[PDB]
């Protein structure tokens, strides 16, 4: 019912904007003008439809040209964006090399079975007995699945996304301890196999997350 009620509000609201867009065209005959005709145009055409329902989120951006302060603040953003475009090309190129190195290092080593007793896809089949919370008196039957990690280094894109998540400092200890246990190409992990592989993550964090991000803020300040 709320959608139906709000559906009548747009009916009236869209009339006004059609009146003003034709009213100005009477006395005229900028790229900022096409957007105003587009916002009312998407509400008209809508009268698939899912894309047109999302594309009509441009309504709050129609006030940019009707506010001097808002227009000036918006222009300053694109002025600053082009200035910070030199350090963006460097921190993106540097992330790609680390993504390639991570692809070389852990390319398909982040696999594991549902139960930590089978260490290859052949044995990781069928059902297994799972013991809840460590109790040996509460077993439950579960199916074992040989599944990959959510953030893996299979290709250059998954590696780039995982490195982005690491550089955002979120969930990176999990990936670090998952990469330390990375045993082989298509076999399960071993507890603390190669601790010394943490040097990759430490160097990446120091070079990009700490240095390349602070240089960005410093450059903006200067």
């Amino acid at each position: 019912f709320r959608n139906t009620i709000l559906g009548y509000f747009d009916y009236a609201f869209t009339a006004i904007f059609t009146v003003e867009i034709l009213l100005k065209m009477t006395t005229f005959g900028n790229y900022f003008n096409l957007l105003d005709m587009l916002v009312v145009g998407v509400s008209l055409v809508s009268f698939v439809v899912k894309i047109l329902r999302v594309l009509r989120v441009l309504r709050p951006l129609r006030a940019i040209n009707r506010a001097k302060g808002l227009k000036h603040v918006v222009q300053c953003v694109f002025v600053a964006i082009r200035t910070i475009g030199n350090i963006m090309i460097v921190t993106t190129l540097l992330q790609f090399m680390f993504a390639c190195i991570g692809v070389q290092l852990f390319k398909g080593k982040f696999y594991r079975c549902t139960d930590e007793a089978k260490s290859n896809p052949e044995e990781c089949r069928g059902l297994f007995i799972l013991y809840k919370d460590g109790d040996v008196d509460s077993p439950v039957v579960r199916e074992r699945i040989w599944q990959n990690s959510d953030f893996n280094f299979d290709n250059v894109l998954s590696a780039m996304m995982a490195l982005f998540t690491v550089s955002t400092f979120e969930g990176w200890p999990a990936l670090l301890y998952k990469a330390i246990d990375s045993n082989g190409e298509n076999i399960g992990p071993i507890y603390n196999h190669r601790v010394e592989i943490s040097i990759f993550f430490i160097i990446y964090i120091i070079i990009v997350a700490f240095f390349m991000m602070n240089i960005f803020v410093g450059f903006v300040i200067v």
């Binding site: 190129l93 090399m97 390639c100 190195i101 070389q104 290092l105 299979d154 290709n155 250059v156």
Partner: protein, 158 residues
Amino acid sequence: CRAAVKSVTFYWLVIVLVFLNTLTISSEHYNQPDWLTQIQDIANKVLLALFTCEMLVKMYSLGLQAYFVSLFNRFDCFVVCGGITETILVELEIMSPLGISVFRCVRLLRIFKVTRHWTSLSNLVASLLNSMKSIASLLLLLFLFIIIFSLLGMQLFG
């Protein structure tokens, strides 16, 4: 042959070879088809041969003692020598399964050859290279700060 080096048709041709070098490194993936590794490792030898020929051209054309002044040429010849080292190493009786993947990193550095002429990037690089005695001094103090608290944690929560 300096007319074929200080020209515009050679610098813009080296960029294509560098890009094709990056393309063969940023194409490996888990369970990659058997026909892709063949292209990868033939392009390996072919493009390495082109790069070492390019180094031989840019090694005896202006001056051997004036090239060592430039850090890039000494840095790039190191990569060229490392690359020519592993071609026979892999084909010979030195398998090094972990040594195959580690060097590809040391051979994928040839991507810095597209950033030599910036004049907006090297201007701050030359400034941060002059303050290396302070950059490596702040880091060595941060490392000492991390070491002391790690040793202290090893006692309290060891």
